[PDB]
Design a protein around this ligand. Sequence first.
Ligand SMILES: CC(C)=CCC/C(C)=C/CSP(=O)(O)OP(=O)(O)O
Ligand SMILES: CC(C)=CCC/C(C)=C/CSP(=O)(O)OP(=O)(O)O
Ligand SMILES: CC(C)=CCC/C(C)=C/CSP(=O)(O)OP(=O)(O)O
Ligand SMILES: CC(C)=CCC/C(C)=C/CSP(=O)(O)OP(=O)(O)O
Lengths: 397, 398, 397, 398
Amino acid sequence: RPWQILSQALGFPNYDQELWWQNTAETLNRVLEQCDYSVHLQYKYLAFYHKYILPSLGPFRRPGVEPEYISGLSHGGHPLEISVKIDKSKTICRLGLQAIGPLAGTARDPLNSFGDRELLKNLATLLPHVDLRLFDHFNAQVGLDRAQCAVATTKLIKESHNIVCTSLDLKDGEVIPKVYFSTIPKGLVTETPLFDLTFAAIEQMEVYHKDAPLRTALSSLKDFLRPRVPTDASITPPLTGLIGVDCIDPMLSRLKVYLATFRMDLSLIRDYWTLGGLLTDAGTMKGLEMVETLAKTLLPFGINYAMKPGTAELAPPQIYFPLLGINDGFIADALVEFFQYMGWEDQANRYKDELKAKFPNVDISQTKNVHRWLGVAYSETKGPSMNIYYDVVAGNV
Amino acid sequence: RPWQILSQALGFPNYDQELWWQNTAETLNRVLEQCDYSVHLQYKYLAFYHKYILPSLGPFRRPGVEPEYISGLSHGGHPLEISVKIDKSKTICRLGLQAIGPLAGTARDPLNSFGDRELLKNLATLLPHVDLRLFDHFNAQVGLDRAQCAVATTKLIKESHNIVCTSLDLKDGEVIPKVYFSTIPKGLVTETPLFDLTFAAIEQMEVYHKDAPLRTALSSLKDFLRPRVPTDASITPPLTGLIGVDCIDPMLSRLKVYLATFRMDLSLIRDYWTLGGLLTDAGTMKGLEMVETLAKTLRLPFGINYAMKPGTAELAPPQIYFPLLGINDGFIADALVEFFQYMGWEDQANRYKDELKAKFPNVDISQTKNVHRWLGVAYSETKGPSMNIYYDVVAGNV
Amino acid sequence: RPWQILSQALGFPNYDQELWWQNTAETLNRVLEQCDYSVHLQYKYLAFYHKYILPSLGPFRRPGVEPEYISGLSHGGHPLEISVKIDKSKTICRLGLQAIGPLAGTARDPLNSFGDRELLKNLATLLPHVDLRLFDHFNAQVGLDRAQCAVATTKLIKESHNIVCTSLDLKDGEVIPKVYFSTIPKGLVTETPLFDLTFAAIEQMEVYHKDAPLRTALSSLKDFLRPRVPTDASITPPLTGLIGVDCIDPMLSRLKVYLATFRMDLSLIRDYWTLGGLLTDAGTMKGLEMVETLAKTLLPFGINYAMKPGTAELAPPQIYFPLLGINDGFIADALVEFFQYMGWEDQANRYKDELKAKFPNVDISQTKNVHRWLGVAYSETKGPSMNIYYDVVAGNV
Amino acid sequence: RPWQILSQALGFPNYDQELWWQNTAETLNRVLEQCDYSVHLQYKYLAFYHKYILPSLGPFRRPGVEPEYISGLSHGGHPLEISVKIDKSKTICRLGLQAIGPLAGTARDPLNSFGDRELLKNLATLLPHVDLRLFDHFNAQVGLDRAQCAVATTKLIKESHNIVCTSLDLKDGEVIPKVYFSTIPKGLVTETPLFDLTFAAIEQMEVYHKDAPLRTALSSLKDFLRPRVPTDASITPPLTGLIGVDCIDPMLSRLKVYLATFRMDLSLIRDYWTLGGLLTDAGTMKGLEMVETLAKTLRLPFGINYAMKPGTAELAPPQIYFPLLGINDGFIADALVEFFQYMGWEDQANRYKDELKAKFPNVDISQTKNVHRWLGVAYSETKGPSMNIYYDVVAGNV
Ligand SMILES: CC(C)=CCC/C(C)=C/CSP(=O)(O)OP(=O)(O)O
Ligand SMILES: CC(C)=CCC/C(C)=C/CSP(=O)(O)OP(=O)(O)O
Ligand SMILES: CC(C)=CCC/C(C)=C/CSP(=O)(O)OP(=O)(O)O
Ligand SMILES: CC(C)=CCC/C(C)=C/CSP(=O)(O)OP(=O)(O)O
């Protein structure tokens, strides 16, 4: 199998990398097989993962070895998730990580401020269409100096000592990077409202200055958000907690504004999904029915508003449900049910057996940490989709 | 001597780093001695240089070995300069380089777009006061993607295939980084006027949005520049060719707008120095007299660098850079002696020549015309007059 | 194709590595395909080649860039050859290289004394059955200190400033390393006879002390060689110029003693092949007829005497014919003829078309440097075989 | 101070290297000062240490972070010691380490078989007189393949999962490497007597084949050892546990055979020191009196190290190593003062305690029992008496 062949051919520079491979790569290869990637792409993505991602992952937290940097991306503190994005017809695999610098979580780098960009630089000489300009824009607007990073660490739990996260879509035959910047450290240290910071960073983008439609969409979103998030500097959910961009040509990149909140019920889902009554069309409502059904059939909730240059009008957000603490066999049975409801019979009929085969070392009827998040979306052009995020290390140990 | 001891202690990871050391470090150690740095700071800076700068300099261009990336920073194509900044009371040493990535000047990195930031990241875990926000801001506004970088290379000579360069001030026992971003590649690829792209990038700075005084100073500079630099997309002089920032807290960083031009005479000097009559105070006029005198005493373009600080509403006189490539270095030394006497810096005058010879022991500097590359002169209200002398260190050694 | 997929997935740390890949890896992948390696082994070997060999190859000599170290392994000074070993039924691909240290050919490393062992160390943590003890034994007996290496360089042409060479057999599904140590630098600097040095280094092996049969074989070989190679310190071919070992368990390793000479004619072939009349059996003679025929149908000639612990009796050597300067289309037509004579009809019928497909950038009817060496062997148990060494860079530029 | 300046100039590639520096370099700089190394040599050695030794030390074992490889070189499992060698006229500093590979103590490298050679290769391009031939010889004779290394790990406690270690003498402004190869893993895996495997490896040396005098000295040592060490395959004392060489021209290298044993009293000391009566000369007897006196003034095994040089036919007295782990370090300091007075080294006696406290400022050395780990004593016909004091530097700092 590719993951075994690459281990034979490449070995490992060090033991943490070897332990990362032994705890993730068989799962990754399985996901790729299940999603119908050809063998040549399996090799491509696994070889890429070996060379670029393994060294980015830092030490492998395990009994007796407590790293200096502890990630919020997973239950055991490992800076890695693997996700799938499921349509009617097809499934795409994606990696989410934090790239860990070698002084991360110590005085010289308290918020792991440098590793992700270093990874992106290696990707920019690897891949012709990687563009770092929006990364650099937002790193400039929300990043902090060393002293400020140290102040932020005294105000934040260990699992939130970060400023950026990276995801890599393994799509078509390419690697497509996207990043998310956190607003909280800058809000805490500057005592500036999260809302003001978020929109000020956005309004200073080059593309915002050139694109009237984006400015119109952003003004509707600010109207919607202003009354719903804090006006003061407090970290009171609901709040504008992340800004996401795609590492592509800025005029093509989707700009994402992510809300985090700890309350969700039907009223709130409806409010978020329709932007308080702004969106009342049939596509929107069909999406809403999906999301309501999913909630009935079934960490903060997330709401992600995505905007593109050239589009004046806002769409429904993607909504993220946290699943940590809920039985993974229950979740699987629920998703089978939801897939049937969506008419995705094939996905329903394979979901549970494929889930087990992804995570052979664990008994999913006994685990509660393997499914970590579920995202749901509905797009006027693309259709409905569902994003499932897995704590791959929890699924392997 | 420190440069020799460090060569013995540390060796070299490869032969290009060894050649960079054998052509630069003895000079650098000399400069630091001549500037009255203590032995401990000589070690600090030479060890820093070995660890951080040698790998950043890439291959050492030499007969039989042509790198893929050729720098415009020096005559022989070497991405390094060493400068001194001279006052009444003190002299400080500065390094200027381009950090060369390992695929620089090839399809995967046509304009060497990544090495300087990588160096800066390493400096940010080394030094507590290094700040990358303004670097990242301007890299975002004036940097180009790979395909654009490839287009730019078809429109620029090999020595101008760059977007950024870095200087490191070796001051107060610290290393203070500053960078300069080139506007030309973006201007060429986007067919936008240099003046428009320069000020649009500046106007999107976070600090510009928060600081009324900086906006006001910028606004006076634009009024001065707009009728003097092109309004079209042409690359013709005087032009806004570089944006400089200091890699420190954005609220403390000096923002620089550098003009390049070929034409200079006393009336242009006055125009640049006084911003066409805007500045008429005694300090300004005393400065002007100094700069005129230097010009009389004395091909690359002239430079004119307008430096602005958040919290300051008013423009000061720029620093003026005289290009010295092609002029005999013994003449330049005699000219500087003369100028130092005129400023009343007798001690600097009496040591300049002997010190120059001792900086460059492997070459006869009276026979060279490329060792002195630039001379910058400045006057400050609070700080006094200063002179910046930029040396092509490799031309001084090979 | 694997070589293209790996280039997409891995990129290159630097431009010399990229140029090595662009001048060799398509050829390598072609060789592996032609030899019926499965796709999974093609990936294994090409990924291995990317990770381990590319950085070992040093700079890529090209117009305007003259490295400090110039290899004798190829016509353009590149430290690389690809060879095939052909039987009746099957063909095996092998890599020959010098691993170039980053100070090679300069005062701090005048004879490139360190790179090969550094490569072997990385292989010893990659591959479970790699054994370095014989490497270290011979490096101890024939290696030189810095001053001695500098003296040797004043007495040797630039293309012979080396002490070790490495080959990697890509066999079964493994990588099997072998090395060759040169005796000449130590002979020159110490003014010791090459014969004395060679046998003294051998007689100090641990396995020689434990294995009576090897000592008996070695005593017959010394009897045969003593009158034929110099008794003085001169570098007068015929001479004992290399010692070869396999980097495996010393009790399994073949020990090789390689003679170089500039004269070969029928008398001498017969003398070398039969060890001056010692070997007169039917297998030996059948081998001799092969070798004579090959010579008629068609750098020093080489003669390689291989011995194994547990075997008291010497076998016929492998004989190496240099082909540099001879037309590569002529060579191909000759080999087709020789293959037919051996009854290897299938090999004959595909040789020329496969050769062209290995080296598509060149016209083999116009080149004289692509075939560099040919080795012929006959083994009592294994049968006849032929080793063809290609200047892969000459075949690509 | 140099250790601080280098930390400022160089920083650290990772947090384990930073912790190694923060627990060792201040001590090391102190030792070098105390030994009257000039500031330039202090820089030379501390910069060398930063570049070459810090990466070789692997992870810094500490609460919450357990490495895969645990060294027997120190009490806390840290692969580092610092020693001083004291004469009448001078004191020199030595580093002892294991160079830890990145897969050490795991399936791909169970006995850390590659790191020390890799360090030595880097030293061989750094320093002109470093020679790897004897290293490679003994690595060939006593080193093991992966499967054998895995077998050995099942028969040895974690702290003895090693085959080699390295010392670096910081002498004459140079770095002089030496190594010690363990015989036990080969003895265990092959079930061969340690005595037989030790001498078979020695007897295959190129220099042994060329040097009649060394063979003769070896022959006298074997006669002495054969009735004292086991004839069977057992790992019981006194045993031939290490072979030491200097990484120099084989014809100049001292070959060492190190015995380990637990039992010592005055009659055993005499036996080891005189080789059971073989040596009876005045120098030898004067040495013996010294060593007896030290023993009276004063768990790891005792060591006895027999050092032989090509061209010398006759055996000299060994160096004897007293194990000091578990004994109070204030007592040891008082004992050494007493011994120094007895040797007539008044100045060394008068400074020993104060200097010890200044070497280890972060710990109260009067409360510790692991900081002094070994004390070696030697007498040489030509050179005089000497004392080697080995410190667990990390135990002196944490
Ligand atoms: C770890 C935190 C803060 C939230 C977990 C959920 C998460 C990382 C959503 C990322 S948005 P994304 O995966 O990029 O959604 P798509 O546009 O790729 O479909
Ligand atoms: C314009 C071209 C071709 C190269 C750049 C010229 C150059 C080295 C400008 C340096 S300005 P700088 O050294 O930063 O002067 P200060 O403001 O530090 O006094
Ligand atoms: C470059 C020089 C000195 C000779 C060229 C021929 C050469 C390298 C023969 C190697 S012997 P080898 O390839 O290992 O023969 P096999 O036992 O592998 O069949
Ligand atoms: C025997 C065990 C458990 C560890 C080795 C003990 C050790 C550090 C011996 C060093 S002998 P050494 O420092 O080389 O003495 P010198 O001959 O240099 O005077």
